[PDB]
Amino acid sequence: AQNPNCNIMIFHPTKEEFNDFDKYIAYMESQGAHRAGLAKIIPPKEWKARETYDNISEILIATPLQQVASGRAGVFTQYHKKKKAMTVGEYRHLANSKKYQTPPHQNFEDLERKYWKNRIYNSPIYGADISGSLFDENTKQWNLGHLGTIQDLLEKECGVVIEGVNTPYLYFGMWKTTFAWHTEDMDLYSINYLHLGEPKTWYVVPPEHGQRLERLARELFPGSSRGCGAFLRHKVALISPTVLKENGIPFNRITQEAGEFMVTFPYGYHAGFNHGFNCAEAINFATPRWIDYGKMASQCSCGEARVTFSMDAFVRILQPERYDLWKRG
Ligand SMILES: [NH3+]NC(=O)[C@H](NC(=O)CCCCc1ccccc1)c1nn[nH]n1
Ligand SMILES: [Cl-]
Ligand code: NI
Ligand SMILES: [Zn+2]
Numbered sequence: 001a002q003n004p005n006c007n008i009m010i011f012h013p014t015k016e017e018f019n020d021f022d023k024y025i026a027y028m029e030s031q032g033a034h035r036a037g038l039a040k041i042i043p044p045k046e047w048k049a050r051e052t053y054d055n056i057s058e059i060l061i062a063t064p065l066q067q068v069a070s071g072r073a074g075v076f077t078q079y080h081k082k083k084k085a086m087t088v089g090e091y092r093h094l095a096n097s098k099k100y101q102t103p104p105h106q107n108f109e110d111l112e113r114k115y116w117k118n119r120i121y122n123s124p125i126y127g128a129d130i131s132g133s134l135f136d137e138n139t140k141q142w143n144l145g146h147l148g149t150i151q152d153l154l155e156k157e158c159g160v161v162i163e164g165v166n167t168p169y170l171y172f173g174m175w176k177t178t179f180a181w182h183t184e185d186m187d188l189y190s191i192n193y194l195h196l197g198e199p200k201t202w203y204v205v206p207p208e209h210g211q212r213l214e215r216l217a218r219e220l221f222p223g224s225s226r227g228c229g230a231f232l233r234h235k236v237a238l239i240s241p242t243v244l245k246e247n248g249i250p251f252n253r254i255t256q257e258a259g260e261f262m263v264t265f266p267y268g269y270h271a272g273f274n275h276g277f278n279c280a281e282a283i284n285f286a287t288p289r290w291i292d293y294g295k296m297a298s299q300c301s302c303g304e305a306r307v308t309f310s311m312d313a314f315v316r317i318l319q320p321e322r323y324d325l326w327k328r329g
Helices: 021-030 089-094 108-121 149-159 207-221 222-227 239-247 287-294 313-318 320-328
Strands: 010-011 036-041 065-072 076-084 123-132 169-173 178-182 189-197 199-203 237-239 252-256 261-264 270-274 276-286
Touching: 010 021, 021 036, 036 252, 065 108, 076 178, 089 123, 089 169, 108 199, 108 239, 149 276, 149 287, 149 313, 169 287, 178 237, 207 237, 207 239, 287 313, 313 320
Parallel strands: 010 036
Antiparallel strands: 036 261, 065 076, 065 123, 076 237, 123 169, 169 276, 178 270, 189 261, 189 276, 199 252, 199 270
């Protein structure tokens, strides 16, 4: 069996290997990459997403989110407080201001220590799930605005057309901005390109051990757990690597830098934080291997779910028994 220890694997495709997205995802899985839940892909030197990032300051962040934490340093939740709209130029200035700028640090490890020591005592501002793309039209390889849609994948695999579209999202980050433990909607894959700026550190649990994380989360957030059988779908809960290790949860970590892709795999729980001002782009996608995960994916019905885009048709076709009551929610 490939990658039995579920290590995060890093791939360096040639320009020839970078032409067929589906084929390369399949290749990575043939080497066991999905067992980790997360893989890094470094594009060939000949490739670029766009020519320059000099003209992005006028993008609007319509609803910046101030991430206020409650709890303890290693076990906390965050609430996303809506702020006034601002441009990316204004956001970048704010991220670099004395209140929000990255502190001095020796290396990624030192910054990671500072993050988990001090995160809860600050409330950074985050731009999330902004429909849009920064890939040049003329970028033909791994352009997250030109992948095959999930609706087309479901039709190809299962035979029925469904409504819906599948478009990419932009994310604007600063130091300590945080993404809570989650899998993707309907346990889809995701792919994330870091366009510009400072790194993003990721934590991931192997899909085969995902239920171990869920059990710990129920123990650590018992009120939330009584309110919803799938409360990690709310995307507000954080657990530190130290607490995961204390509780024997298998996980791995890796830092993504500008110009690098990360792929998350079906039912791979992940969480992480940004090191400083950056801009990323991401989209969910599917493969034939996703179908059985979509059939089994947990759903939140309590009204608290954070869902990036409409999964109704996926639930309707893949989970007909659930459809009705999931829809009541
Ligand atoms: N799949 N997505 C990810 O892995 C990361 N983004 C998120 O999870 C979005 C977190 C927003 C959650 C939220 C917002 C408002 C109210 C409640 C919860 C990401 N961040 N940067 N790149 N990816
Ligand atoms: Cl700090
Ligand atoms: Ni994600
Ligand atoms: Zn819920």
